[PDB]
Amino acid sequence: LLCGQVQDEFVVSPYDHKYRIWEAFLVVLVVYTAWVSPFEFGFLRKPRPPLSITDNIVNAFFAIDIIMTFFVGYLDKSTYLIVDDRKQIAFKYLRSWFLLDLVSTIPSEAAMRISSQSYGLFNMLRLWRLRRVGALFARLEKDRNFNYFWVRCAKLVCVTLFAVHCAACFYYLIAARNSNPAKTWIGANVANFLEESLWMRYVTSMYWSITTLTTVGYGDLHPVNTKEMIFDIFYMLFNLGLTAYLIGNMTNLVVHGTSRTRNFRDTIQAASNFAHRNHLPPRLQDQMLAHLCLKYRTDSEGLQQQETLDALPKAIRSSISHFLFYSLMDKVYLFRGVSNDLLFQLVSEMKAEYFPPKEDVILQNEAPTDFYILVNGTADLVDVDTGTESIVREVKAGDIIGEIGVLCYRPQLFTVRTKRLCQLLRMNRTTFLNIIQANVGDGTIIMNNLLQHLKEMNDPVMTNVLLEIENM
Amino acid sequence: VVSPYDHKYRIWEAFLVVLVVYTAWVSPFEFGFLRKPRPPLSITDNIVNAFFAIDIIMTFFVGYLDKSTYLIVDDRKQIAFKYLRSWFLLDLVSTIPSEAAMRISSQSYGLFNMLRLWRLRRVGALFARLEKDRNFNYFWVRCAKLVCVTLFAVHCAACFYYLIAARNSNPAKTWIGANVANFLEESLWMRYVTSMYWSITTLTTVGYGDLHPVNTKEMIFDIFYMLFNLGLTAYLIGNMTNLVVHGTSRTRNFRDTIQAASNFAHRNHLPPRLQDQMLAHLCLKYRTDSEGLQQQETLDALPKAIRSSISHFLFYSLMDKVYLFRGVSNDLLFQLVSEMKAEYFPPKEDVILQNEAPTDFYILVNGTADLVDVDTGTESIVREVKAGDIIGEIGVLCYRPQLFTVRTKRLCQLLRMNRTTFLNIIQANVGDGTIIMNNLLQHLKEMNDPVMTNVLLEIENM
Amino acid sequence: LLCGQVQDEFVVSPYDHKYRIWEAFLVVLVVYTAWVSPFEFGFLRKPRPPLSITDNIVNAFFAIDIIMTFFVGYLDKSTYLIVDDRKQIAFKYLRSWFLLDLVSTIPSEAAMRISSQSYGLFNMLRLWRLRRVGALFARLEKDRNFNYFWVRCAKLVCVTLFAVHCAACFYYLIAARNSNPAKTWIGANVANFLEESLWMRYVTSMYWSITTLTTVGYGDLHPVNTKEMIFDIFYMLFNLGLTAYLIGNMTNLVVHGTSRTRNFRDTIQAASNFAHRNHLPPRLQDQMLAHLCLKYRTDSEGLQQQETLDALPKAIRSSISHFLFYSLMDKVYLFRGVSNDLLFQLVSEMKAEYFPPKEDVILQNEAPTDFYILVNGTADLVDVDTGTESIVREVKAGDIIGEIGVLCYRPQLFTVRTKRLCQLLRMNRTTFLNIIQANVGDGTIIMNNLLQHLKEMNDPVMTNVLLEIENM
Amino acid sequence: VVSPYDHKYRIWEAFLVVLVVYTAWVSPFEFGFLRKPRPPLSITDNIVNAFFAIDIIMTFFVGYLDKSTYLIVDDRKQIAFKYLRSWFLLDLVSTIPSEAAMRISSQSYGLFNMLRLWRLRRVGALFARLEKDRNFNYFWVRCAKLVCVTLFAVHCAACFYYLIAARNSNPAKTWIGANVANFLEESLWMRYVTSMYWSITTLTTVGYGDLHPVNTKEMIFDIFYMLFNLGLTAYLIGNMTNLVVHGTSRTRNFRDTIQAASNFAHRNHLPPRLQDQMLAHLCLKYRTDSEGLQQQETLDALPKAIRSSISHFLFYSLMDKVYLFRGVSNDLLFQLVSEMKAEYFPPKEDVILQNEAPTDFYILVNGTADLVDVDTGTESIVREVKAGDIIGEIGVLCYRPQLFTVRTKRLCQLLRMNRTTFLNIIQANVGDGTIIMNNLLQHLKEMNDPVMTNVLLEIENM
Ligand SMILES: [K+]
Ligand SMILES: [K+]
Ligand SMILES: [K+]
């Protein structure tokens, strides 16, 4: 019960802290300009002081960014190194985006000087600064410290808010830039717009955009002339896909999060209900559920370890195995006095594994393929040669399992049952023979083996007698 | 001192849940539609506050479970000094009677009454507990939680929107003032119904057209309300999709399993005499729920040792009743029962053919079978075999083609043990082989059926 | 290319035909009454001739069904047999549903005779006949001949249509049963209802119900008084969940249908793009994609066969194996002259398998565990003992593979490579020894083996020479 | 006779696609808004009809692919007798000019012009072909097909609804007559725009309120229209959900793989010196797309024989350039290259440590590495090793602790050969061991680095 509950539960680097803390500051300005540019494009025809001053400030900041970005190295994809070549940095920045960044920094006063018909379509050029938020969202998605669900939710919220704002600004622009204002969507409802506060018109247009996007459609503020009808047709066509995309993303976030818990939940629910019904055992039913809980943990760790390995080079896997098991392997009785390099080679190919309690790692009278070594827990040696399952000896962490059968090429002697959650490490017979063959120190192993057979009475002696007869 | 899980405390929590629901409904209503204590309701508010005061004084005497506690921590400190440091002040400010707050200030009625919403932690904890239960489905309580939060959102939005309408001078030029002439001179029931109708119309994205925002404050509120509505609707649709996907997998799995089996049968061009039988067996396996496939899907995941004990416990009383195993041993029977395979057979099917090669002998557990013998086109019934009886054992022990065809009558569950495995086990324990042989010999005493068998064997028995 | 395209591409039984063709006929009457009862409950207060006559006819038909169902046996869940016991049939029908079926058959004239205030709520009792459509849908879902997608779509369509009809009838009933008709949802729009055609009122109410369900909400025909507001509140509250359920079902039908296409699609897309890029081979890249196509077919069939088997009793699996392989194994050279029963026992435990072309079923110098037999295709015998991969002999369908190593308990002789899609069947060494031990016919096998060693020159002879000294 | 896949025929089909789109747009428009041939458009209709007549007379000369055909069937019969028996009559009735149908009857203009919609089989076949392509995504063409059918449904509904409005006497008391005073006395453009606006408003479930059905015919049509709309919206949402689910699995897989690796590293309490390296390796392997993980995910699924030939072809020119293998053999090199493991290393890392146990020697394929030697805290660069060169071979062949630390400069791909495997391979072919040894000995002639090694080995070489 307790276990089951637990289971359920002067250039600069592009990575400097002083540069990352400043690049992220430009996201605030990107948000500000993304809000301002459609509002200025729709509701304003001439630069007003309280907005023009801030626009000039932001343009100066982005010009500072442009003049600074020439001193920032990048990471080559074919080298994974900082380029640190001012010749290459400039010829990459110019080819990637330099004129687009430049045109998005000219103050609106200069645009008006060129032509008064401008300053509407010129402010929309400042939307080019929206690549920074996309790059930031990509980095956040490819980052571990930030939750995927909240990142996706924030991205969706930003997208829908920007769409609402842009649509509202465009639709109010269509309303205002029209003779006979009484024949417009807002002129047929208020009948006195272009005279009251800008805040009222902004909130009215935003309310219309929100009602149209969420498909509420109250009925006030509806298109009258043909241009508004066409724009609203296209807007609703976009909104259908936008809502479908939002629903799909929400479904995707809702699923695959609790999905991998449900396999465990139902595979244990079947066991629990089968135990509860059909002559419920007193305590055996409690034993089996703990075994299932341990197995679900064992295979997951046995798979995560297998997944993270076999994808790394041998040079680092060998180092990891040496860090984990070389110290423990020094206590192995067979490898006593052998050359030190052979120990390293053996450790580098040990293939650690895990086993649930009451599991038969080796069964009696089987083909000799592998020999095991204990790391954690303990196991009991049993044999059915006498007709009964009686234990012979208990092996603790630090002894070999079934080494007699593999060395002498004969079927195993005793069935090994792990009375506890045991971590083992097994290496094949063919690999052992290959390693021994490409070496000169191998007599010590057989001397240690034969010495060990003497310490056990009459169980190995028959095998020892056979080996002595077979050696001659 | 009392411990959790007690039937005098869980019932008390379940009773406090309905009071929490009452508070969650009432507090926004008094915040929006009410100004004075309104004795029609302040007495009930005081009653609920007294009940929650009883709870807050009672909670000092209840234990809890820590990360590694022994299922209970029954002391004064470490529970009094834990509760006071988590939410004591919030649970105390949210139970002060509204009558007292009037003396402090007369304009804080609704604002102070909205503090009672802190009691929703009870509902949150209940939903969290039901999420990790066994008798209740997971997605079916997730959807209930979504429905509850949707209803709460609708009620809160309606109350806030009517508050915005009422707290504005010149009641005309408002969402309710433009439709209803003088709403302020009408019953509270109809105004509440109208506000709730508007809230539901906005939430379900119907938007009939009546009761729409007029001034800027209502538009500003409604924009955020609609954004929250879109988010909530998307989340609810996702949860419903997950519930549907994970709530009908059994039928799809059965369908695709049967389709794959039929494709396999067709690929090798098996005769229909086999296809019908395998289809019937598979339909029986995937139709009997919690007994047919459950036993296999459970015992398969055991490491041949725990399931051995399971079969020993589940098949010992029936095993000891057979005549073949009378006085063999108390561990040989353990090995025997651990070396059996459980099988099921649909009715009107034969498990043993007459004059077949003797390879298996069965032990009946449930149901009945008829020992059908044929002389010349006559399926004369010899006798009926009941539960807890052995069949087909005389052909495998005494090597000979099978005597009688065993056709099943009802839905039966059989235990099958291989001849080779039984011979290997018997050869390993020769001492019980004599017991088995004499038990078989003494049983062969019925009318003229095995009489020649004893004599024929005695020819080679010297 | 071609292979890849192919891979992508007087009682009666309750099962009598004359009874199934009549029970399905009652579904038409169930649909008719499911349409009529809400319409009669809302739009009609007294039994009109053209509807009362048909209602009496349908009631007579259902009374005939009631009086006939006493002569139909059922299938017991604990027996899976037709009960055929008229004593038990009646005591099951009465306990399950007899009074509910009876009350849903009384003609409406009798209900009016009891009280004129009735005949509204009495017609809604006829909705009890909706269990038949539910049972039919369950049977269709549990049936193979009918597509799951279309059954689910039809069920959803029926549910939503019934909801629309019931809501429309209830809402028109609320409108009509009210004094001062000018203060109703339909009285404020038409202002002359209760006087024009019933068809107009029915279609108007249905149009309102459809507009409310699909969340269009044009604006005409909206609630006015409090009762209509409450009913509409509850109706839209139900509609939200109904639409969520429909969307969830549609998503579930859309996914899991093309899902198991995409694993193959992307696992072959990766291979195709890797072959196209990075020094595309002339024809080797064509060879590997065919191997992947064959493997995707091989493991699928190898899994479907494994899934359908191991779930059936041994008595039928043995019969299937005997039908498939007993005739073929008669040609096996080792089992010539052995007792016939031993052949049956061997056939019962052969565990047939499949292998893609250019696959090594047995590799040289491995532990002797299994020996194989060919069924289809052919394989080539290769050995690296000479330092090169040179074929020695080609084995056709009907010969054993690696039988020398398993019998003599020595490492295998030659690596076996399947030059074509080969179906094999392998059985273990321990099983073979157990089968041989529980028998008396075994000398024939070893004599046949030794005779076979003489037909091959100097390759088995060294092993045969060792065996001659090993036997002594 | 011409065969499919020809660039003079596929282009022709792609050009007919836009004509099919034009017909699909125009035919409902003329059915609804038009009565007479309207020469402003009948000339274009006749042009398109002539083009489709050219196509229908041309299709007698194009082959096809059957179930087991040899990619083409170029005859007169079995293609003429197949096309004439499948859709010849439909493709001929759907190309008769509308001028001819006027003589038959003047009231069948729109009904006969609606028969041109049969040409949508071209778009259907195009979408089916694009579904089973390689350069185009599957869900991204499914969504395009859904968008196209949604647009077609909107257009058809708008045309039908305006036809219903116009074909009714007393134009007032209609959905457009109640809003627009005299719609029949206004331009076709504005009427079409209004009808399309109503159709889009109904489809997106906005329902502003203007242009609503008045009489019973419009209500009856609109009920079925809304039901179809609900079905189409549900299907489109399902398809979009499937696209989203199957379009972002790569990022989730990378995230969960990195999370699992970090959990494994933390569980065993590895030092950071290993955690950073393994995280860098995993990020590099999951970041390099189409070259890093693609090679492993491809070669892993090969049965050790085809991938052997792949490595033989991909690693023979570079292998033959090494000084160690000059005149060794033409099959031993095949075995060696088939017995190599491909590995990748991020820059600024060391693959061989100085004075380590000699166990592997590498062959560089791409990138550069620096042979770093340290005397006393001085990482003096000895020399740079380029692509197609062997490293660390002097320590494994001549058993000795490694001489120089090989630190990588760029992103490199290496081939690793195990000392034990190489020794076993060499021992199997002794005649080439002499060649390998003398090739090694002759190379040992640089300045003072291996001079003592040659002498020291010659001490034991007698
Ligand atoms: K809507
Ligand atoms: K709406
Ligand atoms: K509306």
Q: Which three-class secondary structure string do you get for chain B?
A: CECCCCCCCHHHHHHHHHHHHHHHHHHHHHHHHCCCCCHHHHHHHHHHHHHHHHHHHHHHHECCCCCCCCCCCCCCCCCHHHHCCCCHHHHHHCCCCHHHHHHHCCCCHHHHHHHHHHHHHHHHHHHHHHHCCCCCCCHHHHHHHHHHHHHHHHHHHHHHHHHHHHCCCCCCCCCCCCCCCCHHHCCHHHHHHHHHHHHHHHHCCCCCCCCCCCCHHHHHHHHHHHHHHHHHHHHHHHHHHHHHHHHCHHHHHHHHHHHHHHHHHHHCCCCHHHHHHHHHHHHHHHHCCCCHHHHHHHHCCCCCCHHHHHHHHHCCHHHHCCCCCCCCCCCHHHHHHHCCEEEEECCCCEEECCCCCCCEEEEEEECCEEEEEECCCCEEEEEEECCCEEECHHHHHCCCCCCCEEEECCCEEEEEEEHHHHHHHHHHCHHHHHHHHHHHHHHCCCCCCCHHHHHHHHHHCC
Closest CA to C104 of C168, C13, C36, C12: C36
Which residues does chain D have within 8 Å of residue C214's beta carbon, measured at their own beta carbons? Answer: 205, 226-227, 229-230
Q: For residue D406, give the H/E element and its range.
A: strand D405-408
Which residues does chain D have within 8 Å of residue A319's beta carbon, measured at their own beta carbons? Answer: 274
Residues 6+ apart with CB under 8 A from D279: D258, D261, D262, D265
Asked if D342 and D295 touch (Cβ cutoff 8 Å), the reply is: yes
Backbone angles phi, psi at A372, to 5 degrees: -110, 160
- Upper half-sphere CA count for residue B344 (Cβ side, 13 Å): 23
Give the count of Cβ contacts less than 8 A between chain B and C.
Answer: 168
CB count in 10 Å sphere of residue B66: 12
Which residues does chain A have within 8 Å of residue D284's beta carbon, measured at their own beta carbons? Answer: 80
Q: Binding-site residues of C for a nucleoside 3',5'-cyclic phosphate, please?
A: 334-455
The CATH architecture one would assign to domain A324-471 is Sandwich (2.60)
| Distance from the alpha carbon of residue A219 to the mean position of ligand 2, in angstroms | 9
Whole-number Å distance between alpha carbons of B208 and B187:
24
Whole-number Å distance between alpha carbons of A376 and A356:
12
Nearest-Cα residue of chain C relative to residue D67: C6
Question: ∠D31-D35-D37 over CA atoms, to 5°?
Answer: 95
Closest CA to A205 of A171, A235, A181, A180: A171
DSSP A226-276: HHHHHHHHHHHHHHHHHHHHHHHHHHHHHTTTSHHHHHHHHHHHHHHHHHH
Hey, are the CB atoms on D298 and C358 less than 8 Å from each other? no
Whole-number Å distance between alpha carbons of B207 and C280:
61
Question: ∠D134-D137-D139 over CA atoms, to 5°?
Answer: 140
A438: distance to nearest CA of chain D, Å? 6
CA R_g for chain C: 37
Whole-number Å distance between alpha carbons of D379 and C311:
67
Show the tokens assigned to D24: 């699909």
Hey, are the CB atoms on D230 and C253 less than 8 Å from each other? no
* Contacts by residues A107-111 (CB-CB < 8 Å, ≥ 24 positions apart): A107/A55, A107/A56, A107/A59, A108/A47, A108/A52, A108/A55, A109/A47, A109/A52, A109/A56
Whole-number Å distance between alpha carbons of D210 and C218:
8
Whole-number Å distance between alpha carbons of B18 and B123:
9
Backbone angles phi, psi at D3, to 5 degrees: -105, 150
Closest CA to A80 of D12, D392, D83, D410: D410
Q: For residue A202, give the H/E element and its range.
A: helix A198-213
Residues 6+ apart with CB under 8 A from A365: A411, A412, C430
Which chains lie within 8 Å of chain B at 3 or more CB pairs, if any?
A, C, D
The Cα-based distances of A379 to A361, B426, D287 in angstroms read 10, 29, 43
Q: Is D373 helix (H, G, I), strand (E, B) or coil?
A: strand
Whole-number Å distance between alpha carbons of A399 and A376:
11
In our burial notation (b when 16+ CB lie closer than 10 A, e otherwise), range B373-395 reads: beeeeeeeeeeebeeebbbbbbb
Whole-number Å distance between alpha carbons of C343 and C444:
13
Smallest Cβ–Cβ distance between D298 and the set C218, C270, C279 belongs to C270
Q: Is C430 helix (H, G, I), strand (E, B) or coil?
A: helix
Q: Would the CA dihedral through C327, C331, C334, C340 be positive or negative? A: positive
Question: ∠C117-C122-C126 over CA atoms, to 5°?
Answer: 165
Q: Is C33 helix (H, G, I), strand (E, B) or coil?
A: helix
Smallest Cβ–Cβ distance between C367 and the set A219, A365, A367 belongs to A367
CATH 2.60.120.10 fits D324-460, yes or no: yes
Whole-number Å distance between alpha carbons of A233 and A239:
10
Amino acid at A347: V
**To which residue do tokens 């003032």 refer?**
B177
| Distance from the alpha carbon of residue B234 to the mean position of ligand 1, in angstroms | 13
Asked if C295 and C418 touch (Cβ cutoff 8 Å), the reply is: no
Ligand that lies nearest to the alpha carbon of residue B209, given by its number in the listed order: 3
In our burial notation (b when 16+ CB lie closer than 10 A, e otherwise), range D421-460 reads: bbbebbebbeebeebbeebbbeeeeeeeebeeeeeebeee
Q: Is C422 helix (H, G, I), strand (E, B) or coil?
A: strand
Q: Ramachandran region of residue A188, left (φ > 0), alpha (ψ -120 to 50) or beta?
A: alpha
Q: For residue C448, give the H/E element and its range.
A: helix C443-455
C438: distance to nearest CA of chain B, Å? 6
Closest CA to C2 of A11, D68, A122, A279: D68
Give the count of Cβ contacts less than 8 A between chain C and D.
Answer: 125
C311: distance to nearest CA of chain B, Å? 8
Asked if D29 and D161 touch (Cβ cutoff 8 Å), the reply is: no
The Cα-based distances of C87 to B456, C19, C71, C75 in angstroms read 51, 21, 11, 15
The Cα-based distances of D19 to D5, D54, D87, D455 in angstroms read 20, 13, 19, 86
Tally of residues, chain A:
472
CB count in 10 Å sphere of residue C438: 18
CA R_g for chain D: 38
Show the tokens assigned to B198: 């508007």
Burial of D140 from C-beta contacts in 10 A (0-12 / 13-18 / 19+): exposed
Asked if C146 and C140 touch (Cβ cutoff 8 Å), the reply is: yes
Show the tokens assigned to D311: 């490595």
Q: For residue A390, give the H/E element and its range.
A: strand A390-395
Q: Binding-site residues of A, please?
A: 334-455
| Distance from the alpha carbon of residue B176 to the mean position of ligand 3, in angstroms | 16
Q: Binding-site residues of A for a nucleoside 3',5'-cyclic phosphate, please?
A: 334-455
Hey, are the CB atoms on B212 and A219 less than 8 Å from each other? yes
| Distance from the alpha carbon of residue B206 to the mean position of ligand 2, in angstroms | 4
CB count in 10 Å sphere of residue B220: 16
Q: Is A421 helix (H, G, I), strand (E, B) or coil?
A: coil
Closest CA to C168 of C239, C108, C116: C239
Which chains lie within 8 Å of chain A at 3 or more CB pairs, if any?
B, C, D
Whole-number Å distance between alpha carbons of A445 and A439:
12
Closest CA to B318 of B300, B336, B304, B331: B336
Closest CA to C326 of C304, C350, C301: C350
The residues spanned by each domain of chain A are 17-253, 259-300, 324-471
Question: ∠D350-D353-D357 over CA atoms, to 5°?
Answer: 140
Whole-number Å distance between alpha carbons of A245 and C203:
35
Burial of A378 from C-beta contacts in 10 A (0-12 / 13-18 / 19+): middle
Resolution in units of Å = 3.4
Whole-number Å distance between alpha carbons of D140 and D118:
25
Asked if B398 and B457 touch (Cβ cutoff 8 Å), the reply is: yes
CA B194 to chain centre: 41
C244: distance to nearest CA of chain B, Å? 5
End-to-end Cα distance, chain C: 59
Residues 6+ apart with CB under 8 A from A283: none
Closest CA to A41 of A120, A152, A145, A154: A120
Whole-number Å distance between alpha carbons of A442 and A439:
7
Whole-number Å distance between alpha carbons of A93 and D226:
53
DSSP D220-285: HHHHHHHHHHHHHHHHHHHHHHHHHHHHSHHHHHHHHHHHHHHHHHHHTT--HHHHHHHHHHHHHH
The Cα-based distances of B349 to B273, B370, D131 in angstroms read 12, 10, 49
Asked if B289 and B310 touch (Cβ cutoff 8 Å), the reply is: no
Asked if B20 and B122 touch (Cβ cutoff 8 Å), the reply is: yes
Q: How many helices (H) and strands (E) does chain D have?
A: 20, 8
Whole-number Å distance between alpha carbons of B57 and C272:
72
Whole-number Å distance between alpha carbons of D302 and C288:
7
Which residues does chain A have within 8 Å of residue C366's beta carbon, measured at their own beta carbons? Answer: 430
Angle between helix axes C226-254 and B216-247 (nearest 10 degrees) is: 50
Show the tokens assigned to C439: 């028998």
Hey, are the CB atoms on B207 and A211 less than 8 Å from each other? yes
The CATH architecture one would assign to domain B302-460 is Sandwich (2.60)
Tell me the CATH number for domain C328-471: 2.60.120.10
**To which residue do tokens 């499914």 refer?**
D142
Burial of B447 from C-beta contacts in 10 A (0-12 / 13-18 / 19+): exposed
Whole-number Å distance between alpha carbons of A234 and A215:
14
Backbone angles phi, psi at C216, to 5 degrees: -80, -55
Amino acid at B165: A
Q: For residue C32, give the H/E element and its range.
A: helix C25-43
Closest CA to D58 of D10, D5, D14, D1: D1
**To which residue do tokens 């055909």 refer?**
D69
Backbone angles phi, psi at A217, to 5 degrees: 60, 70
Whole-number Å distance between alpha carbons of A217 and B212:
10
Burial of D229 from C-beta contacts in 10 A (0-12 / 13-18 / 19+): buried
Asked if A455 and A401 touch (Cβ cutoff 8 Å), the reply is: no
Asked if B351 and B405 touch (Cβ cutoff 8 Å), the reply is: no
Hey, are the CB atoms on C248 and B251 less than 8 Å from each other? no
Which residues does chain A have within 8 Å of residue C211's beta carbon, measured at their own beta carbons? Answer: none
Q: Is C360 helix (H, G, I), strand (E, B) or coil?
A: strand
Give the count of Cβ contacts less than 8 A between chain A and C.
Answer: 16
Residues 6+ apart with CB under 8 A from C361: C355, C372, C379, C401, C416, C417, C418, C422, C424
Beta strands at C379-383 and B379-385: parallel, antiparallel or unpaired: unpaired
Hey, are the CB atoms on C207 and D229 less than 8 Å from each other? no
End-to-end Cα distance, chain A: 59
